[PDB]
Amino acid sequence: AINYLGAGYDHVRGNPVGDPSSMGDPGIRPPVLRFTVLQPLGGYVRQYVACRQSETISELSNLSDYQNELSVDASLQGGDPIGLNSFSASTGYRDFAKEVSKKDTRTYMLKNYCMRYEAGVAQKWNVTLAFAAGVSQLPDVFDAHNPECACSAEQWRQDQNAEACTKTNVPIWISFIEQFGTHFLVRLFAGGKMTYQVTAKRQMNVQKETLVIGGRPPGQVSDPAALAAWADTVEELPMPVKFEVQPLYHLLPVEKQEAFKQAVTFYSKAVGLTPQ
Amino acid sequence: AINYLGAGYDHVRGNPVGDPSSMGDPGIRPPVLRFTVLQPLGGYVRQYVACRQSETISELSNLSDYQNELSVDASLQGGDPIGLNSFSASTGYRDFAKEVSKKDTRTYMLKNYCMRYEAGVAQKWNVTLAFAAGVSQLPDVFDAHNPECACSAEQWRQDQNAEACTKTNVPIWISFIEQFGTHFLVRLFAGGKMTYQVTAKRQMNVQKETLVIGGRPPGQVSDPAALAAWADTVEELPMPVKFEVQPLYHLLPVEKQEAFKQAVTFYSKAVGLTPQ
Amino acid sequence: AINYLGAGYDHVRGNPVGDPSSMGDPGIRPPVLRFTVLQPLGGYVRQYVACRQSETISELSNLSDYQNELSVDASLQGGDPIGLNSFSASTGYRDFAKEVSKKDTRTYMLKNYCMRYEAGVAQKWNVTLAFAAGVSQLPDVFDAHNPECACSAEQWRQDQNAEACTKTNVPIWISFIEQFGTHFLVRLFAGGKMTYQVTAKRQMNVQKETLVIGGRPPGQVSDPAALAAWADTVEELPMPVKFEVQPLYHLLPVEKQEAFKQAVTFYSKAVGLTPQ
Amino acid sequence: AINYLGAGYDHVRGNPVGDPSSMGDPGIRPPVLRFTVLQPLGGYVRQYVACRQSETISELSNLSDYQNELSVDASLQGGDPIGLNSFSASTGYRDFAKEVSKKDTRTYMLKNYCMRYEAGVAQKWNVTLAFAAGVSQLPDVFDAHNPECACSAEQWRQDQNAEACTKTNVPIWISFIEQFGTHFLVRLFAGGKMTYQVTAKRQMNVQKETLVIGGRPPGQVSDPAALAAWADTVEELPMPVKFEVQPLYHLLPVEKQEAFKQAVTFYSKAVGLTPQ
Amino acid sequence: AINYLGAGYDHVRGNPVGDPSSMGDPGIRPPVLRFTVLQPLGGYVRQYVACRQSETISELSNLSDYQNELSVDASLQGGDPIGLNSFSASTGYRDFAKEVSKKDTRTYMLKNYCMRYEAGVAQKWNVTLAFAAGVSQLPDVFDAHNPECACSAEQWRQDQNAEACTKTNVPIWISFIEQFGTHFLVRLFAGGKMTYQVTAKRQMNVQKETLVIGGRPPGQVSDPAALAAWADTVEELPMPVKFEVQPLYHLLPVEKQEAFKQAVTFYSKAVGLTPQ
Amino acid sequence: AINYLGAGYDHVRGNPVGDPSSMGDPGIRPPVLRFTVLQPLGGYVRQYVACRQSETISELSNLSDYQNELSVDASLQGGDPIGLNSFSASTGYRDFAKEVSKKDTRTYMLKNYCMRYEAGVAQKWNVTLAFAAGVSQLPDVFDAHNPECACSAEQWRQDQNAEACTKTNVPIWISFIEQFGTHFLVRLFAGGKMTYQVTAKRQMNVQKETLVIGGRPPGQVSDPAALAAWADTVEELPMPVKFEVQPLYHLLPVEKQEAFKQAVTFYSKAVGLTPQ
Ligand SMILES: *[C@@H]1O[C@H](CO)[C@@H](O)[C@H](O)[C@H]1NC(C)=O
Ligand SMILES: *[C@@H]1O[C@H](CO)[C@@H](O)[C@H](O)[C@H]1NC(C)=O
Ligand SMILES: *[C@@H]1O[C@H](CO)[C@@H](O)[C@H](O)[C@H]1NC(C)=O
Ligand SMILES: *[C@@H]1O[C@H](CO)[C@@H](O)[C@H](O)[C@H]1NC(C)=O
Ligand SMILES: *[C@@H]1O[C@H](CO)[C@@H](O)[C@H](O)[C@H]1NC(C)=O
Ligand SMILES: *[C@@H]1O[C@H](CO)[C@@H](O)[C@H](O)[C@H]1NC(C)=O
DSSP, X not given: OOOOTTEEEOTXXXXXXXXXXXXXXXXXXXXXXXXXXXOOTTEEEEEEEEEEEEEEEEEEOSHHHHHHHHHTTEEETTSOBOOSSTTTTSHHHHHHHHHHHOTTEEEEEEEEEEEEEEEEEXXXXXXXXXXXXXXXXXXXXXXXXXXXXSSOHHHHHHOTTSHHHHTSSHHHHHHHHHHHOSEEXXXXXXXXXEEEXXXXXXXOOEEEEEEEESSSOOSOSSOHHHHHHHHHHHTTSOEEEEEEEEEGGGGSOHHHHHHHHHHHXXXXXXXXXXXX | XXXXXXXXXXXXXXXXXXXXXXXSOTTEEEEOEEOOOOOOTTEEEEEEEEEEXXXXXXXXXXXXXXXXXXXXXXXXXXXXXXXXXXXXXXXXXXXXXXXXXXXXXXXXXXXXXXXEEEEEEOOOOEEOHHHHHHHHTSOSSOGXXXXXXXXXXXXXXXXXXXXXXXXXXXXXXXXXXXXXXXEEEXXXXXXXXXXXXXEEEOOOOEEEEEEEESSSOOSOSSOHHHHHXXXXXXXXXXXXXXXXXXXXXXXXXXXXXXXXXXXXXXXXXXXXXXXX | OOOOTTEEEOTTTOOTTXXXXXXXXXXXXXXXXXXXXXXXTTEEEEEEEEEEEEEEEEEEOSHHHHHHHHHHXXXXXXXXXXXXXXXXXXXXXXXXXXHHHOTTEEEEEEEEEEEEEEEEEOOOOEEOHHHHHHHHTOOSSOGGGSTTOSOOHHHHHHOTTSHHHHTSSHHHHHHHHHHHOSEEEEEEEEEXXXXXXEEEEOOOOEEEEEEEESSSOOSOSSOHHHHHHXXXXXXXXXXXXEEEEEEGGGGSOHHHHHHHHHHHHHHHHHHSOOOO | OOOOTTEEEOTXXXXXXXXXXXXXXXXXXXXXXXXXXXXXXXXXXXXXXXXXXXXXXXXEOSHHHHHHHHHTTEEETTSOOOOSSTTTTSHHHHHHHHHHHOTTEEEEEEEEEEEEEEEEEOOOOEEOHHHHHHHHTXXXXXXXXXXXXXXXXXXXXXXXXXXXXXXXXXXXXXXXXXXXXXXXXXXXXXXXEEEEEEEEEOOOOEEEEEEEESSSOOSOSSOHHHHHHHHHXXXXXXXXXXXXEEEGGGGSOHHHHHHXXXXXXXXXXXXXXXXX | OOOOTXXXXXXXXXXXXXXXXXXXXXXXXXXXXXXXXXXXXXEEEEEEEEEEEEEEEEEEOSHHHHHHHHHTTEEETTSOOOOSSTTTTSHHHHHHHHHHHOTTEEEEEEEEEEEEEEEXXXXXXXXXXXXXXXXXXXXXXXXXXXXTOSSXXXXXXXXXXXXXXXXXXXXXXXXXXXXXXXXXXXXXXXXXXXXXXXXXXXXXXXXXXXXXESSSOOSOSSOXXXXXXXXXXXXXXXXXXXXXXXXXXXXXXXXXXXXXXXXXXXXXXXXXXXXX | OOOOTTEEEOTTTOOTTOBXXXXXXXXXXXXXXXXXXXXXXXXXXXXXXXXXXXXXXXXXXXXXXXXXXXXXXXXXTTSXXXXXXTTTTSHHHHHHHHHHHOTTEEEEEEEEEEEEEEEEEOOOOEEOHHHHHHHHTSOSSOGGGSTTOSOOHHHHHHOTTSHHHHTSSHHHHHHHHHHHOSEEEEEEXXXXXXXXXXXXXXXXXXXXXXXXXXXXXXXXXXXXXXXXXXXXHHTTSOEEEEXXXXXXGGGSOHHHHHHHHHHHHHHHHHTSOOOO
């Protein structure tokens, strides 16, 4: 199968309940760590019998409830939320924001976890070659951290190709973040996850949207047989459905760690959406 | 698949819940705009995983409720209703008018949306060759705007072949409208939509009519297997089930815009049905 | 498929809910009108998507309720009942009369309409060649209209081969009516119709008879699969399940119309059953 | 198919709800009448669409109720019961007698009729060749009608091979009755009939026996699919499930009618079971 | 098929609801009677249509309820219980005794009879060759009937190879009993029988054991398809599921009958289990 | 099939409800006893018809309830618990400890037994060759039994390769225990066992984990068909689901029994987890 342990993760663009243009979390990025059924040196893989099943239901009354429900499946190592406008750039976040602004409707989220294995590390890492070259191309200073830098977060949001930004090294940092993300996965439950977002008026007016992680694309969620077939494809193509991450700056040389931290704050502000 | 972004739309003859002689909205017209998975220049296409599902139910007590339920799926850009006797020339509108005039029955509408992708433009357009030639054959003045013109809207409704009309340029404008419509689609959700119209007496007397948009013709709506097969055919032949339009006069030269607006008002009165 | 627009109809022997010896209304007669997906000149055919479904239920307390339930599906143009002992010569009429005479039971009728298309004319007709020859062989006077004619209606009911009738021209008229019926179809909804007649005692004593119009012969009404298969055969062999007729004398030369009206009154009296 | 109109019938050994050693009424005998979809001369055959279904339930508190439930399906022409110890020699009669003698149980009978056609005669008959030869072998006198005849009904019940009977012509008459029965079918509803005899104690102690008429042997009555398959085989092998009979002595020469009537009374007493 | 009429039966080791090491009653022994669809001389076989079905349920509060439920299916001719520690040596008897000793649980038994035919004799029998030779090797006296005989029933239970027993002829008699049983079947209903023994605590703590007679070994009792397949194998391999027996001493020469009765009492005490 | 009678058993690492890395109890070890459908000399094998089914449900409020529910299926001969930190080193034990520490959730365990046969011994054994060689390599004294020995249980838990332990003979004893376990199976019920561990919050928040013993790996527990297929594979690969064990020291020479008992107490403390 595919290894997602050590994969990069964009906490701003990620969404652990899914996206209609991806079969997994859209924040998952190419692998960042390099490793050595089979156990990776320094970590572990524990395979399940069939699928470890779990289900959740939550009434999402505001944006904070949706944020908390996403943070349950994509948090810092230990369970603390990533924050920093996490998930706010994803489509599902914007869709739910539009639906929750309507006070005449109430939305619930139902998660169905079909877990197939667990993997993790415990801590002297070696990174991938692509990540190493990318880091070697990074400067030691983040230009937008300087007060009165012409390239501010709004300037990047409005026009990143303006002269105010193209003269600084900000596009290099943002290209790195766009390539590898802001965090990396240190622990994960992989398999399939089928989540239903159900919106009810105040007429039995009810709407139901289906969001899927893992397996092959399912033809019909209402079909029982197609659902079972999707569950059969989950065994073949499992993908992370609940994971914990560590910040990427722990993997950079210290002379770039502070500038990278400033770069990810800048990125979280320019790409992320404050509730406005 | 087939591109419907920029397709013409007759707001008078259209019906966004369907027509028994069409697999889609009977008002959709051949493409009016020309464009350049793949993204059209100036717009966007966002593909879904499987089907984005949604369901609605509404009690239709009068003609205005039906107008509102159709306007939900076929409106001006921004969500405002098209109005101007919209949908009033379609078969479904006349059938429902006949059913709602009977005060001894109550009718409900259940929509089932099976959406596969979204497309749109944001605004320097280029039109199709057929639309350009059609516009080049149009005059600069609409004759029926002149007061005391022998060719009025009622005269066209009674006999459009009469001398009062064949001497004016009105038939040219109406042939253009009959070819390309009155608006054009600027944003759309495409796929399938199965709508049930259920009429109950005041005896468990209940009638149910099925209207379908998108996919291949379904053999049996009561059959579960035939319904699932139709859902499988929606992936192959998706069609607009909820869209937003802009008036066509924005695409004509400025010297013809006023005459075209007068022509579409004339058309809305002569072909459209006021509640009488 | 087969064209039933303009088909003859015997309103006395007809029965729009079916017959165990026919797959359609036993009163339907060979085509009377000649015509020119495809639209017949002077009329229209409107094809449905799948099946337009409808269901009815009625408690039949007496013969008049059954007469009204049949008249709903076989009426004059406009909805008025045909009458004139309509349907009274059909088998189902006699069966239900026998069941309703028993005051210790109560019978209900459940109709299930599976309509596939609608057809009609609007009015200069030409008839078929067989109908033209039949009319050319008709006299201008109906002998039984003369007072004290030896050939009365009951005399025809008892023995039509008696000398009292074989000397008059009545057998010619009755042969014509027996060939083409008394009316002809001017509007029709065709497809399939499954009607259940359920008789309950006053012990859960219940009897259920099934009567079918349209499609191929169904093997088992209780089998779900065989019922679905019948619904699939309705698409192939659709037959009129709800129609409106016009009297046949409108199609005869004026010199024969009065004698034909007298002939159909005589026929309705001799063949039809008054509730005795 | 097989014609049962005019078949002989042993009213003593018959049982219209069935027998496990026969697929039909065990009292049906070879055809007695000879005849000429197709209509037999002197009678009628009326075919149904699919199956005319009917269902009954009755609580059988004593032997008279069971006698009445059987007589409904095998009666004299007009509906009057055959009587004369009818059905009393059949196995099902003896089984039910054993069960109804137990006052600690209560038995119910549920009939399910799946009728496919009706046939009948109206009255100059010709009998079959076998029946004619059998009658020609009959004497004009029945010996056991003579008072103090050594061959009585009890003597026949004890030992029919005793000298008291073999010297008289009683064995000839009883051989004729054993070959052709005592009545013959003049009207019949043929098809399938599944009857359940359900006995409840006074613990939810319930016993259910299945008795089947018509069609092919069904594999499993509790299986839904095997039941449907049996219903499909009923179309192929329909058998009388509700019929009306006339005494056989109407078909014999007048000089033998009285002796045959005495022979059938003798047979009903010697073979039939009075409730002792 | 296999004939079980006249088969020997060990009433001590038998169990008519089944055994996990046998497909039938573990007490059935090789055939003892010799006989001559086809009818055996002196007896009868009555074949059923499909399966004569029956169901029973009983709450087994103590050992006597279980004894009565087994005696229903294996009794003396006429319905009287065999007694004499009948069934007490079988495994199922010991299992249920262990479960009924626990007063914190309650056990119910559900029988499902699938009967295919009935057979019996009515009474000059001839036995099989093996049974005749076995009887010819028997003495005329049973040694353990002599008072104070060193070989008692308890001594046989403790050690049958001790000098106290091997000097007497008791091992010969017990070898005969071990070969042919203690009774023989004179009437039987054969087919399949699925019995569920359900034990409930006093938590929805429930245990269910399945015991089967007849047919082929079933793969899964909870599977509907495997159950139906077992029912189809019952048609191929029917076995006695409810029978009536007569003591074997009626088949021995009179000089050996009394010694055989003493031998079967001895066997019932030494092998049977009194409720201790 | 495979013999598990006489297999070694590690009571510390075992878990009789399963493990996601094993198809059976993870404590089962290679066979320790050597033996001679077929009956092993000194023991017995009793095969069932299909599956002996049983089900249990228990609310697990604390670690002791889980310990008791596991001890039901893996106990000393007679039913007494093994104790000595039994099961505490298994993955399932640690997972349940983590879940029961959360006082905001309540966990239930549902067992489903599908038993296929029972085996046992009654007591002069000969052991396997591997076990005999392993015992011959054992010393007669356990070094860690000496007070103030540098190699204690905590030292073994922290670092077993330290000089404090590698100088003593403790690694030899622990290698023997790691190979053959601490007990061996003397009685067993083998087949399949599907256990559900269901955790409920205090929102219908519910989680369900599936643990399986026996048969082939099941693809999907929620699929009915995959569950039935697993039940079909249990017949092919039955494994112990409820067994009773005896301590291994009964199989060692008397001069090594005390040192082995000290070695297994040492192992139970060093590898086992006390509730801290
Ligand atoms: C990768 O890192 C691991 C430590 O996690 C180390 O053991 C290994 O040697 C490293 N890879 C190489 C090629 O040295
Ligand atoms: C059509 O218009 C688009 C703007 O949306 C433009 O990019 C494109 O070049 C035009 N077509 C051609 C052939 O130039
Ligand atoms: C039949 O009638 C139509 C109009 O109803 C007419 O156009 C046509 O000419 C007629 N048929 C022939 C053969 O002329
Ligand atoms: C049989 O009887 C019919 C009348 O029921 C008669 O028409 C026919 O001639 C008879 N058969 C023969 C061979 O004559
Ligand atoms: C078997 O017994 C029957 C009577 O039960 C008898 O007629 C027959 O002769 C016996 N068999 C032989 C071989 O004699
Ligand atoms: C092992 O012991 C069995 C009895 O349990 C004995 O029959 C057998 O001979 C021994 N093994 C060998 C290889 O002899």
